[PDB]
Every structure is written in C-alpha cells, then in structure tokens.
Design a protein around this nucleic acid. Sequence first.
RNA 1: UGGAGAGUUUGAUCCUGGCUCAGGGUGAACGCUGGCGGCGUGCCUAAGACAUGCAAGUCGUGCGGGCCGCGGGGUU
Length: 150
Amino acid sequence: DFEEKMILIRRTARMQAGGRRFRFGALVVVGDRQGRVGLGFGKAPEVPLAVQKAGYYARRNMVEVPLQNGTIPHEIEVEFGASKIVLKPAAPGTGVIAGAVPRAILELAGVTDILTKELGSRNPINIAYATMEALRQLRTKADVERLRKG
RNA sequence: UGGAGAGUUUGAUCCUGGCUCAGGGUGAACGCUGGCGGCGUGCCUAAGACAUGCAAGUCGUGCGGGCCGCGGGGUU
Ligand SMILES: [K+]
Ligand SMILES: [K+]
Ligand SMILES: [Mg+2]
Ligand SMILES: [Mg+2]
Ligand SMILES: [Mg+2]
Ligand SMILES: [Mg+2]
Ligand SMILES: [Mg+2]
Ligand SMILES: [Mg+2]
Ligand SMILES: [Mg+2]
Ligand SMILES: [Mg+2]
Ligand SMILES: [Mg+2]
Ligand SMILES: [Mg+2]
Ligand SMILES: [Mg+2]
Ligand SMILES: [Mg+2]
Ligand SMILES: [Mg+2]
Ligand SMILES: [Mg+2]
Ligand SMILES: [Mg+2]
Ligand SMILES: [Mg+2]
Ligand SMILES: [Mg+2]
Ligand SMILES: [Mg+2]
Ligand SMILES: [Mg+2]
C-alpha cells in the first residue's frame, strides 16, 4: 500500500571524555505513487531503529501532489537554505531526470516524466526539503481559479 | 520534445570554495592486440631543403619554309 525507500544513511559523532560516540541518521521517503508523498529524517543509536523512525516521521509528514498525466502542472523553483531545486514538467516518454534524492521523492509521488536541476548546495537533506516544499507549493488551474473567485 | 550528479577541508555539522571523476568530441599519437569488406580520411611540425618522371597546350580550315623520301611534268 505504501512504498518506502531510504535516501541516505549517515553516522554522526559527538565527543565525550573517552572518545567519540556515534548516532545514525537516515532519510526515508514513502509514497503510494498516486499523488501522496512523505519525507522523514530519523536519528537513533543504531541504523535499523533510525530507518524505522524515519519511516514513521515520513508517514506523519505527507504532501498531496497534483499530478497532470504523470507530470507536474507548472515549473517550480525553491530555495531551501543554500540549496535550490528547479522543477519543470515534461511530455510523456521523457522519464524522470533528477539527482538521486529528487528522483526517489518524485518517483514515489507517482511522477513519470519531469526535468529537474539541483543548484547551489548539493546537500541531500536540504535538496530533499526543497523538493518537498516545491511539491507543497504546486497549484492546479482549479486552485488558481478558486483563489480568484471574489 | 528539453536540464541527473558524485568524491574531497571536520571528531561530527552547515556554508563558502577550489581540485578531481562519470559524458561527448579529434586530421590524433603511443602501448598491448589484431580476421574480412564498404565508405571516408591521412605533414597539425621546417611557408625547411629537394634527385627524378609527369603535371599546358592546341590549331596545316591563318602563313611561308628547312630536312628526309616518293610520284608526275618542261628536255633526245
Ligand atoms: K528562501
Ligand atoms: K562528508
Ligand atoms: Mg495540492
Ligand atoms: Mg542563499
Ligand atoms: Mg558550491
Ligand atoms: Mg508543444
Ligand atoms: Mg513547450
Ligand atoms: Mg564540491
Ligand atoms: Mg579547518
Ligand atoms: Mg579526517
Ligand atoms: Mg571543531
Ligand atoms: Mg573525456
Ligand atoms: Mg573522453
Ligand atoms: Mg603488431
Ligand atoms: Mg579504403
Ligand atoms: Mg586516398
Ligand atoms: Mg604546412
Ligand atoms: Mg588543428
Ligand atoms: Mg579557322
Ligand atoms: Mg623527281
Ligand atoms: Mg618537243
């Protein structure tokens, strides 16, 4: 019912008298490929607990994506921190062209053809957050005319 | 009908930032290897120096001759 894929897994270290102590962080995307996505970042002393926690957090943070024939309705450009994500809809038969992080996010969202570009900071976390805010800032023509009723 | 990034400064992080890699290209060269054909292509350097052969001539329907030869005339 819900597909779950990890973006990256990293091991961080804090200094304590005696040595360094490790804490694992993991990004996880979850999607039904129908228009709903979710991003989560979990931290835990071990890796599997971090992956499970990231899955829970991702299921708790969902985003409804207005797909229009496997693609996006309009091009977007989002700055998260120093990271920039540029999205642009594509005709069918194009395929998803993106870095690993935005490719995973968009594929789990149900996108089939789109063009992207990562700019500035290539940080996977910030790129993921920028992609999420881009999908959150998407508007359909119905939404546009709904906002301009008056 | 068109756009992917990654490695690397830190104990760990975010940023800035350079270096590097994955791609495509060549009148190429070098190493190892090397079976056939078609179509292309082949002094990027000394516009340095060149043996040798060929590469620009053709018209007797413009004109008069020379040399070699033959035939027929004026003459016993
Ligand atoms: K901003
Ligand atoms: K790192
Ligand atoms: Mg929406
Ligand atoms: Mg900025
Ligand atoms: Mg940069
Ligand atoms: Mg069109
Ligand atoms: Mg167009
Ligand atoms: Mg860099
Ligand atoms: Mg330093
Ligand atoms: Mg180090
Ligand atoms: Mg320090
Ligand atoms: Mg190359
Ligand atoms: Mg090459
Ligand atoms: Mg040989
Ligand atoms: Mg040949
Ligand atoms: Mg030839
Ligand atoms: Mg030359
Ligand atoms: Mg040249
Ligand atoms: Mg004439
Ligand atoms: Mg005679
Ligand atoms: Mg007589």
